[PDB]
Homo-oligomer: A and B are copies of this chain.
Amino acid sequence: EFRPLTLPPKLSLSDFNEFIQDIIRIVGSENVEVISVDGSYMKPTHTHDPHHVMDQDYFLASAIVAPRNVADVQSIVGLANKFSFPLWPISIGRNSGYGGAAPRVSGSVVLDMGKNMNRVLEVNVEGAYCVVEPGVTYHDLHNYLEANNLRDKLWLDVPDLGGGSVLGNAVERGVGYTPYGDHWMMHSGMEVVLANGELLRTGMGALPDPKRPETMGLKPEDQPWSKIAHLFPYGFGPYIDGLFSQSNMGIVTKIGIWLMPNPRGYQSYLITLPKDGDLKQAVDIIRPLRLGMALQNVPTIRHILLDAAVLGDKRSYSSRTEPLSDEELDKIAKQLNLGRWNFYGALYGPEPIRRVLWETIKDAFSAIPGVKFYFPEDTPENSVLRVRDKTMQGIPTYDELKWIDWLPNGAHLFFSPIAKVSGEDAMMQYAVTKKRCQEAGLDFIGTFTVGMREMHHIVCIVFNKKDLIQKRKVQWLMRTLIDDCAANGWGEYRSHLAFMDQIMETYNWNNSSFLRFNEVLKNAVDPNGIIAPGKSGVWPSQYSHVTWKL
């Protein structure tokens, strides 16, 4: 196709054309869209940032290509090398709040790996795992399990929503809510196309399945894995798996994810915490309970405005233009039957064991006056618990999409520091975050998701994506929480596109030895710097720091 809206850097129009002509020859014109519209969650955009904090067309694709299979990927990459054409690989592109499917560098070909590379590759029962291609959503896989009577033997692990890529999310090191909630941790045996075009599998993926007649002359892409590939991550030698999560080191085409066996007993629950300051003692209680396997999963501590926004928009609670007061949140608390904070957990296993745990948990949260315990049955039917009852047993839902509409043309953006699993520290993070929010005039909205020794603090910034004063005030808000949080020893675990640079600039111990060593590994595997340049602040040498850093 003829003439695009932004060309990649140093590339003439002539080339872009002799390039996209060559891509069209391989993939067919059906699998190429050249850009010369925000959409929705269900039909996600592949061109730009749908919850945009910078101008709408700031991070913008030049093309979008949907490779049919692994070989088309090698063919594309070969070409990208020949033309020095940056590539932005996506799986589903539902990475909203972090940029969605937009390229960090405008002009890049967005690689729609998920459109056609779709297959649930294997579901293995006795080894309790699955292999997945980029195009399998959480829902795709769920329906795979149901339509195979498999929901009786194995369970999933889902984020808040069901539309996200299984492998896409995992390489982002994202987080879910059962005992198998550490998604990256649950991987074994990845397949990757390298910057140079070669296919690599990792771990025991590197151990070939022994020759037999059935598998002869199969393209490497299409070859089976040897037994232990998806059972043991480490293989032998240096353990390079993690070079492919939050990286531009590779394009991931296959991943193994371990699936949790049906526990033979399930029960979700809600603990409501009356006062705002009950976060402090709550976290303090969750701490020995996490480290000692009374809490089996990844429980969440939600802010009252998180649940409030799922149920109804802002305009239905107050007409005010400024943020909500402390009295007015107690009013939304007493209203919905929730606390200021709300702690959602789940128990897994046979009744005998659930029994003891639950008494231990109840009897621990009892030192907080006015506390209240609910099973899903006890609550209203539109309740958030009644949604997370599904979420913490591996069932994909979409109800939690509703909080994005807490403001007119709603858009979210995550500020995601990590805090100690100590009540003192969590308050500190809160008060530091809560303060700047009120300065930018945003309401505070967030969850703590409870890891073993860590808490992901998801500060949910919603903003009117068509209010230009406010978008700029969020930018100022973000850039400041980052710096503030650092000045207090907190770094963010994951980053939006426009804060990649700054957040990375945050981990500068010993004069940025981490980024330097990272850069070194980038230039070695991607000589011409074509895979996802700029991702996580890692820039190859042909991209000037002065020109490209934000």
Contacts and interface: CB of A to CB of B under 8 A. Distances in A.
Contacts of A209: 489
Contacts of A287: 126
Nearest to A537: B237
B242 A236 contact: no
A408 B537 CA distance: 59
A350 B352 CA distance: 13
Number of copies: 2
A208 B240 contact: no
Given A228-B491, A453-B231, A509 B127 contact: no
Contacts of A493: 232, 234-236
A507 interface: yes
Interface residues of A, number: 101
Interface in A205-232: 205-210, 220, 223, 226-228, 230-232
B173 A234 contact: yes
A213 to B, nearest CB: 16
A418 interface: yes
A318 interface: no
A280 to B, nearest CB: 14
A126 B538 contact: no
Contacts of A491: 204, 206-207, 226, 228, 235-236
A486 B207 contact: yes
Interface string A329-371: 0000000000000000000011011001100100000000000
Given A228-B418, A491-B207, A516 B198 contact: yes
Interface stretch (A29-37, A108-116, A244-252, A389-397): A244-252
Contacts of A291: 128, 261
A425 interface: yes
B356 A129 contact: no
A420 interface: yes
Nearest to A456: B232
Contact of A198 (B205, B226, B510): B510
A75 interface: no
Contact of A210 (B185, B488, B508): B488
Interface of A: 126-129, 173, 179, 184-185, 188, 194, 198-202, 204-210, 220, 223, 226-228, 230-232, 234-247, 249, 258, 261, 263-264, 287-288, 291-293, 349-350, 352-353, 356-357, 360, 418-422, 425, 451-454, 486-495, 503-504, 506-510, 513-514, 516-518, 520-521, 523-525, 536-538
